[PDB]
């Protein structure tokens, strides 16, 4: 392993004491030297880089920490062994690899303060580990949105910011990016650490020379009313990792991607963007799509009935309109085709996110595929183009429901439809099809030399029961009429009486549980719409950038003034006068 006697002694403390440690250090001093001894560390790939300072900290022994630092221990020793990495398939504990980040990650504020403000070797607060994560990144990582965890993580994050400002006023800790280009805010947004994100976005620090660190400010407060300001830097827009972009384009595995938009400034900002800029554009897009589908429907409805396409254009008004609508329909199909490709290329879904999420883009792409297949068959002199076209037409009209987002009442309904299909209809259809196929095979086996006597006809005939049209005496071409009627009655009882009514009961159960989930998903859907609208924008319009360039404090750590594009939210309180 490479561990020395000092490390062995440190791992064996009796009520936090072990007198032989000072003995070993003094012996090391008197023998040759101490600096190599006190910085002895493991060499094996599992505990690589672990040293006595790490053991002192994790044991929560202040005295050993002070002693080891006093004796020249490296406060920047990085423990990057396998146990100190994320490595979801193995046990371990990630903390940022550094003594300062270790102290912060374990709720030991006194050790943090000592490491920063010791006489011998103060710790580098801006240091970064192998992943590039500094202390703030590690604090974001260890969050798990639980109450007790979140409380101390937010508190320690606050305290480290205060200490960093006091020790290095010109340092901007929150602007440091890891290897992924993520700031701690962007990391919290991407990883779904909703508790920390909710802390940061409305942070307010009430003390001199730390006012500038806040992100929520109170401008005026006349009586119960007071007008607050949220920063919105790196929320609305930035270089790469805008918080809204990070949340909206999450990989669908982020735990709280539905919840994170409930954080106050984000919700109000999205509503403002909607009403100011996006509502009109979205309504216009809906109108255009409606015109597209009406034109397509008209073109399909008046198709000619002669065989062997393509058809000669007749020199008459109706056929000019028909071919015009056909051309426009093919144009729109091509448009949605290329839009689907663009979505795939920009997002690069990893072949599971391609199916478990973003159903709308898949449906529009499939519609466009059916249109293209229709064109190919049409010019290939096959009548089967009709078979393609109708499917596209059907899908096009159902894809109209995509535009139910943007309407608070209807979008929720559409989301609930999606959830019904994905959960309850899928389970029901599996069981129902098992019953249907089983009894169809039984009945068609019983029937001999009849009109039906075939799997398709009997399957359809039993299916008619489900829609309330089952004949119940559709044939006599059998023997053993009692067996036939018993089979039909058993099928009716098992499917019609039990399973459909059970489906209704289960849908009622499900609706009771997905109210808030539906609101969150709809808000997320509308947020994605807003971000796509402002990203494309086709006109170089600057009104997309909201909230106005206001001066918040005007007193940075130096004499400069800060203009931070804040967003105004007026609030009232009838308590705490």
Ligand X SMILES: CCCCCCCCCCCCC(=O)O[C@@H](COC(=O)CCC)COP(=O)(O)O[C@H]1[C@H](O)[C@@H](O)[C@@H](O)[C@@H](O)[C@@H]1O
Which segments are annotated as binding site? Answer: 3, 8, 12, 47-50, 58-59, 359-360, 398, 405, 468, 471
**373 and 337 in contact (C-beta within 8 Å)?**
no
Which of 230, 289, 364, 365 touches its own copies by CB under 8 A?
230
In the complex, minimum distance from the CB of residue 409 to ligand X, in angstroms, rounded to a whole number: 16
In the complex, minimum distance from the CB of residue 269 to ligand X, in angstroms, rounded to a whole number: 19
Nearer to its own copies, 75 or 488 (CB): 488
Residue of 109, 197, 94 lying closest to 145 (CA atoms): 197
251 binds ligand X (CB under 6 A): no
When CB distances are held under 5 to 8 angstroms depending on the partner's kind, the choice from its own copies, ligand X, none that residue 422 binds is ligand X
Token pair in block for residue 63: 């005295």
Nearer to ligand X, 7 or 521 (CB): 521
Nearer to ligand X, 13 or 494 (CB): 494
Which residue, chain included where needed, has tokens 């068959």? 377
Q: How many residues bind its own copies (CB under 8 A)?
A: 188
Token pair in block for residue 310: 């393509």
Nearer to ligand X, 128 or 257 (CB): 257
Nearer to its own copies, 318 or 468 (CB): 468
**H or E, element range at 219:** strand 216-221
Token pair in block for residue 204: 């307010």
When CB distances are held under 5 to 8 angstroms depending on the partner's kind, the choice from its own copies, ligand X, none that residue 345 binds is none
Q: In what order do the strands lie in the sheet with 225-230?
A: 216-221, 225-230, 567-572
**201 and 207 in contact (C-beta within 8 Å)?**
no
When CB distances are held under 5 to 8 angstroms depending on the partner's kind, the choice from its own copies, ligand X, none that residue 382 binds is none
When CB distances are held under 5 to 8 angstroms depending on the partner's kind, the choice from its own copies, ligand X, none that residue 85 binds is none
Using CB under 6 A as the criterion, what x/- string covers residues 415-434 for binding ligand X? ---x--xx------------
**145 and 137 in contact (C-beta within 8 Å)?**
no
Which of 227, 358, 466, 477 touches ligand X by CB under 6 A?
358
100 binds its own copies (CB under 8 A): no
205 binds its own copies (CB under 8 A): no
**50 and 79 in contact (C-beta within 8 Å)?**
yes
562 binds its own copies (CB under 8 A): yes
When CB distances are held under 5 to 8 angstroms depending on the partner's kind, the choice from ligand X, its own copies, none that residue 537 binds is none
When CB distances are held under 5 to 8 angstroms depending on the partner's kind, the choice from its own copies, ligand X, none that residue 363 binds is ligand X
When CB distances are held under 5 to 8 angstroms depending on the partner's kind, the choice from its own copies, ligand X, none that residue 571 binds is its own copies
In sequence order, the 6+-apart residues with CB closer than 8 A to the CB of 287 are: none
Q: By CB under 8 A, which span of 26-34, 120-128, 184-192, 402-410 interacts with its own copies?
A: 402-410
Q: Which residue is nearest to ligand X (CB)?
A: 360
DSSP 389-439: HHHHHHHHHHHGGGGGTT-HHHHHHHHHHHHHIIIIIHHHHHHHHHHHHHH
Token pair in block for residue 464: 């008619």
As a whole number of angstroms, the distance between CA 298 and CA 396 comes to 13
Instruction: Give, as ranges, the residues between 157 and 196 that touch its own copies (CB under 8 A).
Output: none
Which residue, chain included where needed, has tokens 């949340």? 247
As a whole number of angstroms, the distance between CA 66 and CA 117 comes to 12
When CB distances are held under 5 to 8 angstroms depending on the partner's kind, the choice from ligand X, its own copies, none that residue 437 binds is its own copies
As a whole number of angstroms, the distance between CA 220 and CA 229 comes to 10
441 binds ligand X (CB under 6 A): no
DSSP 216-250: EEEEEE-SSEEEEEE--TTTS--SS--HHHHHHT-
Instruction: Give, as ranges, the residues between 367 and 426 that touch ligand X (CB under 6 A).
Output: 391, 394-395, 398-399, 401-402, 418, 421-422
In the complex, minimum distance from the CB of residue 499 to ligand X, in angstroms, rounded to a whole number: 10
In the complex, minimum distance from the CB of residue 183 to ligand X, in angstroms, rounded to a whole number: 24
Q: Which residue ranges make up the annotated binding site for resiniferatoxin? A: 359-360, 398, 405
Burial of 260 (0-12, 13-18, 19+ CB in 10 A): buried
As a whole number of angstroms, the distance between CA 235 and CA 265 comes to 9
Q: By CB under 6 A, which span of 2-10, 468-476, 517-525, 567-575 interacts with ligand X?
A: 517-525
Token pair in block for residue 398: 């159902």
Nearer to its own copies, 230 or 277 (CB): 230
Which of 165, 244, 295, 363 touches its own copies by CB under 8 A?
244
DSSP 302-352: T----SSSS-PPPSSHHHHHHHHHHHHHHHHHHHHHHHHHHHHHHH---SS
Question: Residue 41 forms beta bridges with which residues?
Answer: 51
Q: Which residues of the chain form contacts with ligand X (CB under 6 A)?
A: 252, 357-360, 363, 391, 394-395, 398-399, 401-402, 418, 421-422, 490, 494, 521, 524-525
């Amino acid at each position: 392993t490479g561990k020395t006697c000092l490390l062995k002694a440190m791992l064996n403390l009796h009520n936090g004491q072990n007198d032989t440690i000072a003995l070993l250090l003094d012996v090391a001093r008197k023998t040759d030297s101490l600096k190599q001894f006190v910085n002895a560390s493991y060499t094996d790939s599992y505990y690589k880089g672990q040293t006595a300072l790490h053991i002192a900290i994790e044991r929560r022994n202040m005295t050993l920490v002070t002693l080891l630092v006093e004796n020249g221990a490296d406060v920047q020793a990085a423990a990057n062994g396998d146990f100190f990495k994320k490595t979801k398939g193995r046990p371990g504990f990630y903390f940022g690899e550094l003594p300062l980040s270790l102290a912060a990650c374990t709720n030991q504020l006194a050790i943090v303060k000592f490491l920063l403000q010791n006489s011998w070797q103060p710790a580098d607060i801006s240091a970064r580990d192998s992943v590039g994560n500094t202390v703030l990144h590690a604090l974001v990582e260890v969050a798990d949105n639980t109450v007790d965890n979140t409380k101390f993580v937010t508190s320690m994050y606050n305290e480290i910011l205060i200490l960093g400002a006091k020790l290095h006023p010109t340092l901007k800790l929150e602007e440091i990016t890891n290897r992924k280009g993520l700031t701690p805010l962007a990391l919290a947004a991407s990883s779904g650490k909703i508790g920390v994100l909710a802390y940061i976005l409305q942070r307010e620090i009430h003390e001199p020379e730390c006012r500038h660190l806040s992100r929520k400010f109170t401008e005026w407060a006349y009586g119960p009313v007071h007008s607050s300001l949220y920063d919105l830097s790196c929320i609305d827009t930035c270089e790469k990792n805008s918080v809204l972009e990070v949340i909206a384009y999450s990989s669908s595995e982020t735990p709280n991607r539905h919840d994170m938009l409930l954080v106050e400034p984000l919700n109000r900002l999205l509503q403002d963007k909607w009403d100011r800029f996006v509502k009109r554009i979205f309504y216009f897009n809906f109108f255009v799509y409606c015109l597209y589908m009406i034109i397509f429907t008209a073109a399909a409805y008046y198709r000619p009935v002669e065989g062997l396409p393509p058809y000669k254009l007749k020199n008459t008004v109706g056929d000019y309109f028909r071919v015009t609508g056909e051309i426009l329909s093919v144009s729109g199909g091509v448009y949605f085709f290329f839009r689907g490709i663009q979505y795939f290329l920009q997002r690069r879904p990893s072949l599971k996110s391609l199916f478990v999420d973003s159903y709308s883009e898949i449906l529009f792409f499939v519609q466009s595929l059916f249109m293209l297949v229709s064109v190919v068959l049409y010019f290939s002199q096959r009548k089967e183009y009709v078979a393609s076209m109708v499917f596209s037409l059907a899908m096009g009209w159902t894809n109209m429901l995509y535009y139910t987002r943007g309407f608070q009442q209807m979008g929720i309904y559409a989301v609930m439809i999606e959830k019904m299909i994905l959960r309850d209809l899928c389970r029901f259809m599996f069981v129902y099809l098992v019953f249907l196929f089983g009894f169809s095979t039984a009945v068609v086996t019983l029937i001999e030399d009849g009109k039906y006597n075939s799997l398709y006809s009997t399957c359809l005939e039993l299916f008619k029961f489900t829609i309330g049209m089952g004949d119940l005496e559709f044939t006599e071409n059998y023997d053993f009429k009692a067996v036939f009627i018993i089979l039909l009655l058993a099928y009716v009882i098992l499917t019609y009486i039990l399973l459909l009514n059970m489906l209704i009961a289960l849908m009622g159960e499900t609706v009771n549980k997905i109210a808030q989930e539906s609101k969150n998903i709809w808000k997320l859907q509308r947020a994605i719409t807003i971000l796509d609208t402002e990203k494309s924008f086709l006109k170089c319009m600057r009104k997309a950038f909201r909230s106005g360039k206001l001066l918040q404090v005007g007193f940075t750590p130096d004499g400069k003034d800060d203009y931070r594009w804040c967003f105004r939210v007026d609030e009232v309180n009838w308590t705490t006068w």
